Amino acid sequence: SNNLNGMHLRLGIIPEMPFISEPSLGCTNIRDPSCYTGVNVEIVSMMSQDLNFTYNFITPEDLKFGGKEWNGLIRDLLDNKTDMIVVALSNNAVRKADIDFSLSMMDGGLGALVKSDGTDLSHPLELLNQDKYQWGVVDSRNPELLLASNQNADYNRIAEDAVKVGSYGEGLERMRAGGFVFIDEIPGINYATKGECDIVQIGETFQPFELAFGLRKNSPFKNLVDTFMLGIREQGVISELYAKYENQK
Amino acid sequence: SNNLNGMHLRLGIIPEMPFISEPSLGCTNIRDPSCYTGVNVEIVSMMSQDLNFTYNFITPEDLKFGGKEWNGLIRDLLDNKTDMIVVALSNNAVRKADIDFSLSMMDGGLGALVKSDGTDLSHPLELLNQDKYQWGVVDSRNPELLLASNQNADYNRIAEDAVKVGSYGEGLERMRAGGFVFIDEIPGINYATKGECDIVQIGETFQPFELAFGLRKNSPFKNLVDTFMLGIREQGVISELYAKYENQK
Numbered sequence: 273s274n275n276l277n278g279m280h281l282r283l284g285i286i287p288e289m290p291f292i293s294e295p296s297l298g299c300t301n302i303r304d305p306s307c308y309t310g311v312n313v314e315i316v317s318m319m320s321q322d323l324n325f326t327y328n329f330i331t332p333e334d335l336k337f338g339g340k341e342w343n344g345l346i347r348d349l350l351d352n353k354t355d356m357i358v359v360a361l362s363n364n365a366v367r368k369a370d371i372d373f374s375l376s377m378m379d380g381g382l383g384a385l386v387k388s389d390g391t392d393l394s395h396p397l398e399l400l401n402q403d404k405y406q407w408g409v410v411d412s413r414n415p416e417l418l419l420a421s422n423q424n425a426d427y428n429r430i431a432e433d434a435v436k437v438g439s440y441g442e443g444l445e446r447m448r449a450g451g452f453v454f455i456d457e458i459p460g461i462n463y464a465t466k467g468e469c470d471i472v473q474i475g476e477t478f479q480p481f482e483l484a485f486g487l488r489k490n491s492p493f494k495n496l497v498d499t500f501m502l503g504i505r506e507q508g509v510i511s512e513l514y515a516k517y518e519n520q521k
Numbered sequence: 522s523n524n525l526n527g528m529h530l531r532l533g534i535i536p537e538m539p540f541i542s543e544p545s546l547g548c549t550n551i552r553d554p555s556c557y558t559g560v561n562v563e564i565v566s567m568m569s570q571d572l573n574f575t576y577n578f579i580t581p582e583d584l585k586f587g588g589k590e591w592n593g594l595i596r597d598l599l600d601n602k603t604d605m606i607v608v609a610l611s612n613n614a615v616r617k618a619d620i621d622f623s624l625s626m627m628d629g630g631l632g633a634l635v636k637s638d639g640t641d642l643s644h645p646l647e648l649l650n651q652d653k654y655q656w657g658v659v660d661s662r663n664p665e666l667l668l669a670s671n672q673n674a675d676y677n678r679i680a681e682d683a684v685k686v687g688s689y690g691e692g693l694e695r696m697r698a699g700g701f702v703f704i705d706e707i708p709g710i711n712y713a714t715k716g717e718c719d720i721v722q723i724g725e726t727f728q729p730f731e732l733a734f735g736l737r738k739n740s741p742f743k744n745l746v747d748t749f750m751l752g753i754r755e756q757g758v759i760s761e762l763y764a765k766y767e768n769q770k
């Protein structure tokens with residue numbers, strides 16, 4: 273019964289399926305949630321009904337998730353342009369120093385994906401000892417941040433020598449063209465490459481992380497968000513949404 | 522030197538000169554401060570430069586200042602749609618129960634103004650014992666709220682039996698047409714009627730109040746706003762702005 277009594281929230285988004293779509297082509301206002309679909313758009317709609325808040329979406333000008341002074345979604349949150357980030361925001365230690373994360377919607381991890389040549393690598397760190405494949409990460413997105421901050425200096429070297437692409441879409445494009453290992457996040461990258469039989473994963477998933485919403489420290493509505501998220505997680509609702517969008521593709 | 526480090530604020534406005542103009546006719550976005558002039562628009566511009574915040578303006582759909590569940594500017598502030606109200610918001614006890622007021626920009630009071638008939642009244646409470654003049658107040662604006670909440674049951678009766686108009690402009694219009702005493706706020710109503718020789722004030726100004734900005738309780742930026750406001754008040758800058766706009770008319 274306890275709720276936010278009609279508080280208005282601005283929610284930070286970046287389009288990336290299956291979590292958040294691009295705005296409809298007919299959209300007349302990019303902030304209008306009715307212009308969007310996706311797992312997280314539906315989570316937010318249900319959350320708003322339960323927690324009794326109104327909301328609009330705000331997309332950062334720089335279209336970055338957030339790297340560190342921060343940019344992207346995290347800079348908009350810290351600046352009070354938004355009140356909560358509702359992408360699948362990866363919880364890593366560098367971000368957690370400066371913002372809070374909700375109870376998570378699901379667990380992710382890194383995968384190294386490539387267009388299969390037959391002479392595929394067997395483990396991601398084999399990239400450091402060869403010259404057949406380039407590899408890449410998105411600037412100001414969690415995989416780069418993880419790899420560069422990791423205790424393991426070989427992961428540091430992977431980030432150091434990676435091609436830096438400007439967007440997730442660009443990384444996928446370069447990967448699809450061949451000769452290029454894109455290191456990014458599961459499960460999302462498995463959705464993004466669904467049905468592309470020439471795309472394979474090198475070795476095992478590595479460096480797991482939670483995917484959650486982002487909030488300023490000491491937020492008065494964190495506990496209510498966490499309780500709502502836990503309910504739909506424990507009930508299987510988040511898994512069912514994800515599967516619905518996976519099957520729509 | 523201490524400041525808000527680039528925080529973004531949404532500021533609540535209602536057009537009413539000399540404090541805030543209507544948006545320019547060429548305006549492409551009603552939230553854009555560059556579309557406005559007025560005493561308080563200039564105060565906010567200087568405040569933003571000193572306190573290092575970015576901002577836009579938000580006008581309530583109902584175009585009400587705030588009466589009590591609240592409506593108008595005060596409901597937008599309580600709902601977190603805005604972060605500070607930057608009209609000349611009158612500080613009264615009913616509002617102060619639920620929001621905070623900044624250090625004030627100036628002192629106001631109520632005046633009862635009328636189109637002179639020669640047979641003008643001598644004191645505002647004489648309205649209660651005659652039938653020549655109607656009188657009126659704006660709904661959900663401070664004079665009604667003051668008069669209705671006052672310890673003096675005769676002021677209560679004035680509010681009770683007053684015509685309720687939907688806007689300040691409408692009250693002025695009815696007053697200008699004759700036979701109608703408009704009870705509203707000085708000094709603003711003296712600006713609004715500058716040069717109208719047929720308009721006179723009945724008796725003395727009464728029921729003074731501070732005019733200030735509105736903030737949620739426990740705002741972390743109240744002390745910085747207060748310090749800035751005090752500086753421009755003590756220096757005479759607010760008086761000089763007011764005089765500049767008074768002379769532009």
Ligand code: NA
Nearest residue numbers: 411412416436
């Ligand atoms: Na980079």
Ligand code: NA
Nearest residue numbers: 400425426429
């Ligand atoms: Na190494």
Ligand code: NA
Nearest residue numbers: 660661665685
């Ligand atoms: Na009324």
Ligand code: NA
Nearest residue numbers: 649674675678
């Ligand atoms: Na009376």
